[PDB]
Amino acid sequence: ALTELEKALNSIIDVYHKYSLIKGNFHAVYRDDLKKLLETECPQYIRKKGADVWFKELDINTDGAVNFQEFLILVIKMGVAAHKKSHEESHKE
Template sequence: MEDLQTLQQALAVLVCTFQRYSKKEGDRYTLSKGELKELLENEFPSLGNVSAFEELRSLLDVNKDGEVDFEEYIRFVAVACTLCHEFFFDFPVVLPRGK
């Protein structure tokens, strides 16, 4: 039961994180260039200086409308999860601790 709650919490964090940034300016259903940059800088500090930000934004913006919608954001999250899964595959399964 605890694993189900943890997964539900993880999904809620993904959705709420998108919504927190997408509501800052313009269309609340998409991330503008500035909103996406702020999200990446704050939520993915391990990326460091996002020097390839424009390239990443271009890759995420599949429909080329200049913004990143929720589906495009989730594709990015899925790729990030896949990379983490592959990197940590042989490590013991331990949930990260909260702050």
């Protein structure tokens, strides 16, 4: 049996693999792959920046693809934004 934290991380892994297995290297999310990822998995405040802008920022080692480690940058920024908004809703700030 897995813990909720373990199942959450495996879910994030499955989301990445969903788009990394589309073509080419199995641990590479290419520009067009990331576009479909943003439109399907991400909310509007993430989408508005566009796939081209996100791809350029996420491609840390500049190899023309997004690996899982680079993908976590997007995941964490979403997590922070989600937590920040929920914190601002519980408190009438």
